[PDB]
Design a binder for this molecule. Structure first.
Ligand SMILES: Nc1ncnc2c1ncn2[C@@H]1O[C@H](COP(=O)(O)OP(=O)(O)O)[C@@H](O)[C@H]1O
Length: 254
């Protein structure tokens, strides 16, 4: 199974991705947790300490492997090859979850251009097309990491939104981009709903079949965030919601 989780920053996109990763880590023998969003740490949210996460060097910073994979000094390999060498780009969090941190993309200007991007692209592409084990990658609303090439391999794009017009619009934006790109399934996860009014607002703009589930606002996510980190276990009343979301998710995929 290949999943993409997108959402504007602050919507709780990383928290949702981590939750799904935690829950599906028992239906698969391995899962590629891919942090495609620099602004938030999928690693820490997954339970890693700020030290263990930093140590897992970001794809964008493997300046040597980038030079070697895209040819150096002489050649230039427009199509870097990366497969068996994936497990060298991350760390196993445990016997099931392998984490890869993309690292922030750049643009610069006529200096050291396009190389590293073809590197990350190769990784993403290999993860979705060449690899067979479940993959769950989170990303911002721009879903910049996906391409028509990989889009065909994405079983589902999960748009995480909050219960308000703006955010709902962003969700719809994501649905458009994902669609244009060729992803067949785009489902929503409304996070941080605080009252019933919000739930109604949601239903008034989004169809029922397009909604995976709702996650209530909960102080726990804030407390566990900066101490326990085990923010996703029976201990959390929101886990019931994740279970529902996940179950509904597998009903549509496989
Ligand atoms: N359902 C929720 N209820 C309360 N707080 C939440 C909830 N989901 C996420 N949060 C908080 O939202 C903040 C941003 O989460 P993250 O998932 O890191 O955001 P993004 O990935 O949207 O930048 C985190 O501090 C997280 O604890």
């Amino acid at each position: 199974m290949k999943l993409a989780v997108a959402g504007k920053g602050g919507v709780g996109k990383t928290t949702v991705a981590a939750g799904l990763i935690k829950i599906m880590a028992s239906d698969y023998d391995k899962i590629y947790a891919v942090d495609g969003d620099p602004d938030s740490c999928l690693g820490q949210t997954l339970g890693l300490s700020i030290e263990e996460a930093y140590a897992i060097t970001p794809l964008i910073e493997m300046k040597d492997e980038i030079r070697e994979k895209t040819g150096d000094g002489g050649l230039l390999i427009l199509n870097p090859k990366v497969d068996g060498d994936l497990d060298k780009y991350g760390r196993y969090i445990d016997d099931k979850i392998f984490l890869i941190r993309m690292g922030e993309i750049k643009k610069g200007g006529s200096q050291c251009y396009c190389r590293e991007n073809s590197f990350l692209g190769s990784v993403v592409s290999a993860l979705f097309l060449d690899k067979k084990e479940a993959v769950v990658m989170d990303m911002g609303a721009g879903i910049e990491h996906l391409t028509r090439g990989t889009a065909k391999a994405v079983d589902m794009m999960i748009a995480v939104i909050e219960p308000n017009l703006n955010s709902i619009k962003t969700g719809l934006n994501i649905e458009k981009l994902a669609g244009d790109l060729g992803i067949k399934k785009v489902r929503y996860v409304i996070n941080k709903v605080r009252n019933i009014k919000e739930e109604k607002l949601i239903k008034k703009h989004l169809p029922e079949d397009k909604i995976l589930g709702i996650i209530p606002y909960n102080e726990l996510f804030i407390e566990l965030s900066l101490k326990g980190e085990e923010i996703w276990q029976s201990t959390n009343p929101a886990f019931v919601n994740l279970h529902d979301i996940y179950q509904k998710l597998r009903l549509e995929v496989g």
